[PDB]
Design brief:
7% strand; structural genomics, unknown function; DUF2237 domain-containing protein; two-stranded antiparallel ribbon; alpha+beta; binds bromide ion; DUF2237; Phenylalanyl-tRNA Synthetase, Chain B, domain 1
């Protein structure tokens, strides 16, 4: 897989293990209808906002190998949920090297860069 910069897609998080395929990478495919392609660093603001929008990332769901997130965790977000937060001015920082090029179908690279940690 490739990142938004054209390089090899780096791991987003190995602990907690993230990604739709739970291999730590924000890679996607047919079954990942949510397109978990944006590697972002969680902020309390985003976590609270996205829960208000019906996306609970704080409650653990072990049956989904989901631990419940905390500020500081890096996690592969659905492009749409990151986009929604960006329009609300609360999008969490992006790790470009761990963000799949597929993210470019939802967000412009310049917008991703403006929010990058890297
Ligand atoms: Br798939
Ligand atoms: Br998400």
């Amino acid at each position: 897989s490739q990142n938004v910069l054209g390089g090899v897609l780096r791991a987003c998080s190995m602990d907690p293990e993230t990604g739709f395929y739970r291999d730590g990478h924000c890679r996607t495919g047919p079954r990942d209808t949510g397109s978990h392609v944006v590697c972002a660093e969680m902020t309390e603001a985003f976590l609270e906002y996205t829960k208000r929008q019906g996306n609970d990332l704080m409650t653990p769901r072990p049956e989904m190998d989901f631990p419940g997130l905390e500020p500081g965790d890096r996690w592969c977000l659905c492009a749409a949920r990151w986009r929604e937060a960006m329009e609300a001015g609360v999008a969490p920082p992006v790790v470009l090297a761990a963000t799949s090029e597929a993210a470019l179908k939802a967000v412009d690279l310049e917008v991703l860069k403006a929010h990058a940690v890297d």
